[PDB]
């Protein structure tokens, strides 16, 4: 009976705390290791890694290939980066949790730097959020910090990882807390709007892109702080419908003479009620329909082409038009332009970031010709310096947008 109990104990232990796919700790293992680390010392850092490319693999090539990639990333992650008291677990379907005790901020960065380099050799599309615990924090607090840091990494892909320290003065909220605050901001009309003009070299204004923000108790919140929570909760269409209503009100006032570019989140386009909503509202404001440009992220066209085409049809049937926002980020998978024929393409802002890389300049010219050959206006994005402005000039970009154009 000894052999029964001893081996039954290990199988029960692995059933309770081990995820069969990744062969790492499961979510319950992670919370146990997290709660014990906090109650004893709480000195160290915590990190979360999301493998969105594994999510894209699951429906594309089935789950046999998806499970194999989870195991591969798990095997590659765990055999590398071995330190004392290191907890590595699979806390959800597409994200991994990591606990690094007895490490200060600089030590976590080298571990986080080693994580990312550990995922470049193994598939060649991920996001890494890391937080350092420098105050006494509860377990829900660190998970909220971990989630907001992950949103920071996604919203700024030029960062290798998103870093937030537990002592930060920044407002950190959970997903449902962000949604409640946005609903509060929508209800009380706390929103403010900015209009950035996209101008040609001749001063002709193509359109003015609308940026949404809101303020509560003297604190200002921008869209990249809460948009991850709304899309994860399938509530971003509430936010987009409010912005579209407010923008159309301004056009109905006969004030703005030029077209306005409204950003649309991906989670809103995959909502069929939002696709019906656009047709119903655009038909009630046909006079201003020609002055509305809907800015659709490139991720929509390549990941949700059918939802996007339904949205694009509704937009154009009502006398409006649309463009692409992160144009060029998904290079070698950018043939959707030929099918969709957008009115414009707004370049990925990472093109103004790495001018010196010769391979970056080759991709930039190639996607520039493709749009113009089809008669599609190209727009450079987030241009800050005359150096960026002059370097983008060699790629025959028609109109420019950013702080240097004012």
Ligand X SMILES: Nc1nc2c(ncn2[C@@H]2O[C@@H]3COP(=O)(O)O[C@H]4[C@@H](O)[C@H](n5cnc6c(=O)[nH]c(N)nc65)O[C@@H]4COP(=O)(O)O[C@H]3[C@H]2O)c(=O)[nH]1
- Closer CB to its own copies, 28 or 173, in the complex: 28
65 sits near its own copies (criterion: CB under 8 A): no
Buried b (16+ CB within 10 A) or exposed e, 376-393: bbbbbbbbeeeebbebbe
304 sits near ligand X (criterion: CB under 6 A): no
Structure tokens at 375: 């008669």
7 sits near its own copies (criterion: CB under 8 A): no
- Closer CB to ligand X, 67 or 107, in the complex: 67
Are the CB atoms for 388 and 355 separated by under 8 Å?
yes
- Closer CB to its own copies, 127 or 270, in the complex: 270
Distances 110 to 45, 77, 106 between C-alpha atoms, Å = 12, 14, 7
355 sits near its own copies (criterion: CB under 8 A): no
Structure tokens at 386: 């005359």
Among 1, 2, 3, 5, binds its own copies (CB under 8 A): 5
Within positions 149 to 168, which residues make up the interface with ligand X, using CB under 6 A? 150
- The interface partner of residue 272, options being ligand X, Mg ion, its own copies, none and the CB cut-off 5 to 8 Å by kind, is its own copies
Q: What is the DSSP letter of 18?
A: B
Helices (H), 253-397: 266-269, 272-283, 298-303, 305-317, 336-340, 358-373, 386-393
98 sits near ligand X (criterion: CB under 6 A): no
Among 90, 152, 237, 382, binds ligand X (CB under 6 A): 382
The H-or-E segment that residue 100 falls in is: strand 95-101
Structure tokens at 148: 């907001």
174 sits near ligand X (criterion: CB under 6 A): yes
Are the CB atoms for 317 and 340 separated by under 8 Å?
no
Q: How many residues does the chain have?
A: 406
17 sits near its own copies (criterion: CB under 8 A): yes
Within positions 269 to 328, which residues make up the interface with Mg ion, using CB under 5 A? 295, 325
Report in angstroms how near the CB of residue 329 gets to Mg ion at its nearest.
12
131 sits near ligand X (criterion: CB under 6 A): no
| Residues making contact with its own copies (CB under 8 A) | 5, 8-9, 12-13, 15-17, 28, 271-273, 275-276, 304, 306-307, 309-310
């Amino acid at each position: 009976a000894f052999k029964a109990q001893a081996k039954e104990a290990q199988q029960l232990r692995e059933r309770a705390y081990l995820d069969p796919v990744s062969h790492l700790g499961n979510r319950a293992y992670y919370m146990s290791q997290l709660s014990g680390w906090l109650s004893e010392s709480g000195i160290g850092g915590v990190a979360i890694l999301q493998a969105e490319f594994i999510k894209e693999l699951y429906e594309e090539k089935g789950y046999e290939a998806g499970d194999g990639m989870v195991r591969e990333l798990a095997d590659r992650l765990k055999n590398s980066i071995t330190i004392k008291d290191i907890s590595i677990a699979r806390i959800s379907t597409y994200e991994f949790g990591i606990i690094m005790p007895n490490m200060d901020e600089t030590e976590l960065k080298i571990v986080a730097e080693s994580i990312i380099t550990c995922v470049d050799d193994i598939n060649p599309n991920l996001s890494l959020g890391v937080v350092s615990n420098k105050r006494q924090s509860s377990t829900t607090t660190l998970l909220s910090l971990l989630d907001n840091a992950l949103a920071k990494a996604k919203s700024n892909p030029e960062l290798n990882y998103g870093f937030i320290s537990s002592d930060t003065d920044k407002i950190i909220l959970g997903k449902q807390q962000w949604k409640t605050l946005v609903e509060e901001a929508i209800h009380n009309d706390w929103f403010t709007f900015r209009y950035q003009a996209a101008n040609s070299s001749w001063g002709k204004t193509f359109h003015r892109e609308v940026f949404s923000a809101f303020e509560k108790d003297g604190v200002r919140y921008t869209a990249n702080q809460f948009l991850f929570a709304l899309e994860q909760l399938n509530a971003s269409h509430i936010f987009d419908q409010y912005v579209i209503e407010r923008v159309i009100q301004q056009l109905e006032k006969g004030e703005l003479t030029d077209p306005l570019a409204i950003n649309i989140a991906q989670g809103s386009i995959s909502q069929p009620s939002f696709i019906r909503w656009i047709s119903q509202t655009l038909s009630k404001h046909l006079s201003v329909a020609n002055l509305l440009h809907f800015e659709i992220p490139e991720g929509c066209f390549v990941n949700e082409p059918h939802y996007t085409a339904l949205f694009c049809n509704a937009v154009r049937n009502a006398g409006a038009d649309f463009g692409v926002d992160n144009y060029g980020r998904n290079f070698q998978s950018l043939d959707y332009i030929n099918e969709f024929r957008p009115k414009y393409v707004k370049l990925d802002y990472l093109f103004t970031h790495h001018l010196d890389d010769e391979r970056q300049k080759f991709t930039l010219t190639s996607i520039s010709r493709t749009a113009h050959n089809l008669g599609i206006t190209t727009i450079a994005s987030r241009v800050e310096t005359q150096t960026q402005l002059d370097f983008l000039s060699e790629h025959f970009i028609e109109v420019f947008q950013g702080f240097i154009v004012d």
